[PDB]
Amino acid sequence: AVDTAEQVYISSLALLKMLKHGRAGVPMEVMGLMLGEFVDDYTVRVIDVFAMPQSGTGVSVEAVDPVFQAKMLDMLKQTGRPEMVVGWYHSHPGFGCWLSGVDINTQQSFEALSERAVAVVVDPIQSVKGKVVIDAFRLINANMMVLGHEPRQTTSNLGHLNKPSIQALIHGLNRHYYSITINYRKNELEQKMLLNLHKKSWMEGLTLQDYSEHCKHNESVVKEMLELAKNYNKAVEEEDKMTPEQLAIKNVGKQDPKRHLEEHVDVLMTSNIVQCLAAMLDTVVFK
Template sequence: MPQSGTGVSIEAVDPKNVGYVQANWTVPKMVVGWYHSHPGFGCWLSSSVKGKVVIDAFRLINPQMLMLGQEPRQTTSNIGHLNKPSIQALIHGSNRHYYSIAINYRKNELEQKMLLNLHKKIWTHGLTLPNFTEHTEINGKNVKCKDLDLPFLPKKFCFFDLLMKKFRTMLTLAEPYNKSVQEDSTMTPEQLKTRYVGKQDQKRHLEESGRRYVQ
């Protein structure tokens, strides 16, 4: 629906929709499919919304709380909902005069199944042949046989550049983990309680990297 806005007002009226509503006397109210507000004209979040669907929830920050250094957010956990603000939003006072609120949607069982199947691979994906140009490039790299300085591979080994990078990453994570396991066997239970405080968990990083590379 096209919108037109000025400094003090914004109109979101579709002429075709207005004509349809006027012709249909059973509808008591005029229906407009877009809502926009500027509380106290402190937030100006959008410059052009033609042809877009904008869903954004925000709340103004109390200046007194900001001066006292208090956290204005009622919900501080935005895991899975945190979006990096644009430069235009920061200029207009994002995280200074207002902050975004995490949005949750109500979905029934059928809607959840539909969203889960949105990017699901179909059965014909397994019958698709690889790209000829990419396959030729991979074969050319295999023929060149680059040297790998890895202890668990032969000195001369034909492999892809991507897999070479993955092997080196796994090796850099496996070496400190192997060393830490050997050192743990010589420590007392009291020493083990504070051994990994403030340090990187090598085992977890190794598991996550292996799981990510397998996928």
């Protein structure tokens, strides 16, 4: 009768509702509630994520309106599907992820009212390059002071999916709460239709990018390649032959030998091949 290793099943539209609401008010700590379904002991799912109307207080238990939620939940019973909340979320743009002074209290109020109520922290100012630092957490009780926390029993995936970094284990890990693993519920009827409407172009794959700027682009690159070739000429004729293998390894440039020599040459080669082949095909097709 204890936890081992839970797994949070998030949906594709769940995280999309998380990023847009987090990006919406960035300097005002957006705050909403997480709605899912406890399917068994140690797997938990969430498909539908709604937001909450915020207040002057901010992320707290007071911004959670009870009469708005039950009015909202009742109207969701007839449209879509009725279910019970399984947690909450908030946004910490000022730092990474850890449970704040009042985040731990509203966690206690939710796991006393609901069952376990996993809290999700999303940093909207970090989800920028190609990755998101979304993490969820779960409070452990203070009664297990003589037993080691995270009662893992039959699992070896816990070394994966994140290790606790120095910016995480300073605030509350692992003595207050613990981390949890989250995977992505990918399936068909969602994934291929997202790709075919985002990264897909029908009329664009056969255009010609008319040759005012096209052959013009094949001229500014020849000059800088020539100077690199003359610089490549300068090093190859030079040929220091006193202690060569140490002089080569302590004096690297990472731009002379083959870095700036074939990079643009490859780019100019592929572009005119694509351009001429698309030019030849339309001459085969169009009369």
